[PDB]
Amino acid sequence: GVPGQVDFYARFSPSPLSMKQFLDFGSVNACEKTSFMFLRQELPVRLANIMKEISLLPDNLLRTPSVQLVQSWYIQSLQELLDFKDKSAEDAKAIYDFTDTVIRIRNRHNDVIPTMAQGVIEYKESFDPVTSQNVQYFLDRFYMSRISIRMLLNQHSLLFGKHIGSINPNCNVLEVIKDGYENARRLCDLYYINSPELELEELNAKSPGQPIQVVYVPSHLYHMVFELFKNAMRATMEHHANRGVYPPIQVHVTLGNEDLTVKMSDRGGGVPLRKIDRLFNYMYSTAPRPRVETSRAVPLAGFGYGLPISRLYAQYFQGDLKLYSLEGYGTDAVIYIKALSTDSIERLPVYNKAAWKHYNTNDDWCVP
Amino acid sequence: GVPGQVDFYARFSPSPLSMKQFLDFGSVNACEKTSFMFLRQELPVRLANIMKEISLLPDNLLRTPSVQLVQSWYIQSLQELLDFKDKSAEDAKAIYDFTDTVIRIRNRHNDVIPTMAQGVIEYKESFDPVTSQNVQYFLDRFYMSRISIRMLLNQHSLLFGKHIGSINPNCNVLEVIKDGYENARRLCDLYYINSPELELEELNAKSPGQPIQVVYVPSHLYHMVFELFKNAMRATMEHHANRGVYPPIQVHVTLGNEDLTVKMSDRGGGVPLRKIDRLFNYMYSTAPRPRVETSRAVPLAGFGYGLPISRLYAQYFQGDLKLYSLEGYGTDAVIYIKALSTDSIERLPVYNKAAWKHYNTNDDWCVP
Ligand SMILES: CN(C)C(=O)c1ccc(S(=O)(=O)c2ccc(NC(=O)[C@@](C)(O)C(F)(F)F)c(Cl)c2)cc1
Ligand SMILES: CN(C)C(=O)c1ccc(S(=O)(=O)c2ccc(NC(=O)[C@@](C)(O)C(F)(F)F)c(Cl)c2)cc1
Ligand SMILES: [K+]
Ligand SMILES: [K+]
Known part of the structure; x- marks a missing residue:
């Protein structure tokens, strides 16, 4: 049974x-x-x-x-x-x-x-x-x-x-970033009738001047970058509506000894630190999917948890995805990926006493 | 008794x-x-x-x-x-x-x-x-x-x-940053016989073109900025030793609706994400103070917990201090301060059962 x-x-x-x-x-x-x-x-x-x-x-x-x-x-x-x-x-x-x-x-x-x-x-x-x-x-x-x-x-x-199953042993990081950008850009143009340009720079610090490649699932990397571009593009188009001049999205890729990092920087006005974590809160970002029966463009934020799920993909192989915003200016989003395949270990939830307590539980600092 | x-x-x-x-x-x-x-x-x-x-x-x-x-x-x-x-x-x-x-x-x-x-x-x-x-x-x-x-x-x-006791109701943020820079710079020159330039930009988003001022303890802000400059300067001088050309430290100050933010960006080579938190670990940064009996310059990192204590100052009034590094490239340090005095509430530790448990205590995820 x-x-x-x-x-x-x-x-x-x-x-x-x-x-x-x-x-x-x-x-x-x-x-x-x-x-x-x-x-x-x-x-x-x-x-x-x-x-x-x-x-x-x-x-x-x-x-x-x-x-x-x-x-x-x-x-x-x-x-x-x-x-x-x-x-x-x-x-x-x-x-x-x-x-x-x-x-x-x-x-x-x-x-x-x-x-x-x-x-x-x-x-x-x-x-x-x-x-x-x-x-x-x-x-x-x-x-x-x-x-x-x-x-x-x-x-x-x-x-x-x-490819080995879903894994590309030589995943071309810049190619995937560009693919993410071009697809986000199409959606941006559909909704805002305009979009920011991309400025892309790379630094292979481990082997200077060489293409940056990692062993990776390319569709995982694609999902994170595409979701982050959508996020950066939305903030940019919404902040700069009145002046009608849209600062570009800047992406800096570095391969270091241990970290592959993709930094994405926008001038979208930012979010105060008090609110930035709502981008990763499921309940806060739970919005009804728009109806099928329309030709009106789909917004760049809403149904489907793009941003929390992007971060889960980063963290799945011991990487991470972090946001840093300067309210009134813009926002940096950083993907961290392990440069080495031996460091890329599945992060798996486990059910046990500690997991159960967490559902049935709930202070050493003064409450502000 | x-x-x-x-x-x-x-x-x-x-x-x-x-x-x-x-x-x-x-x-x-x-x-x-x-x-x-x-x-x-x-x-x-x-x-x-x-x-x-x-x-x-x-x-x-x-x-x-x-x-x-x-x-x-x-x-x-x-x-x-x-x-x-x-x-x-x-x-x-x-x-x-x-x-x-x-x-x-x-x-x-x-x-x-x-x-x-x-x-x-x-x-x-x-x-x-x-x-x-x-x-x-x-x-x-x-x-x-x-x-x-x-x-x-x-x-x-x-x-x-x-000033009201230690509080300046009109603390001139850029003036304090400049004071931090000039003092860090003197120490940098003493130790490395060279130092990076400062590039400083500001955006008063709440009241554009006006001086950025907050109600604050200026010596608290001074401590954070000076400690971060020392940190940025050390990484810069150590990474760029061989080429002998030192990229400047760039500081962007924004006053938004709720956040005053000071971003400090260096090209000091960064630190992998696995190690970045050691900068805030007391035991890891516990180094013997150098002897009095020498004229050899004091290093820009060592005795006295400059960086964790800077972060405590930020967090004391409900602000924060965060580091984001791209290994092989450089590092951003961000101070967050509450723009409003009514939001600036002391963060105070309290002793009770929860505090005590924390000393006498010690999992729902697979251990990597
Ligand atoms: C020659 N050779 C097969 C090896 O070097 C080898 C042998 C075993 C391992 S392993 O770590 O035990 C291992 C690694 C992966 C798998 N399985 C799979 O990859 C799949 C296809 O079953 C999975 F579905 F992805 F899990 C298994 Cl069954 C074992 C890894 C490598
Ligand atoms: C006119 N007036 C005095 C007020 O508006 C007022 C009156 C009381 C408060 S308060 O929040 O209760 C308060 C605020 C601060 C203090 N005390 C102090 O500031 C000091 C000097 O004792 C301290 F040491 F800093 F704490 C005290 Cl004793 C009370 C705040 C403001
Ligand atoms: K189990
Ligand atoms: K108590």
């Missing part, structure tokens, strides 16, 4: 892999058998761990139709995977069947992020600061968990169903 | 004042009586609260001669203040005597910061990561507490023994 199975697998801790390990596994004659042996335990472990926390959500959120749907997807995928814990690594039909199942799960779970977001809209619409700390804690973990699950599903599906 | 008195006063919580309250109190016919009535409770409360945490330090730190000396200073000041809880607000001799006592305490406590730092050197020299979290927690609180105590002692001593 499901709670039995969820309880068994949720006792285990997820096991993080490094970018180097993902890479070395798939690089030369990736082994389907070996992948089966790992994932038939690991995917059920990851699924069960985060399912335990879906159960701790406020009842009015958990009971939303969109959250009920996501939970049912997880329940089904867990069950399908557990059909295989008894099968043999030597059973070629079992391996084939497992691979089919992984590919199928990959499709079922495609819409998980916006369906969850729709849940939060359903909950916000019909219904609290007591539990809004719980929702923030949950969504960071649920979306990081989903990122990690989708990584495994993609690796295995692409390897078995120059 | 001392533990009796410490226990009584440590039950109370310190009471934070705003910059506006400090200002309005002293602006027009500051009342000595009223100041006596507040401080005869408040100074014993603040003293007793932090004394409780000195007692929780690791035994090998607490027992250092320099920590023993600081504790004895606190014990004596507490005792002297408590001679007055029985006296009358109407007893003019008692008011005179209290004011004398405040002035005397102000002198006794002059050397508290470096004497405490000497304690940490004594402890480091003769003797652990288990308790190094406790020392970090303690020193932030002890130094913030000391900042708050010294504020009260200074206000009362200057008022009764255009």
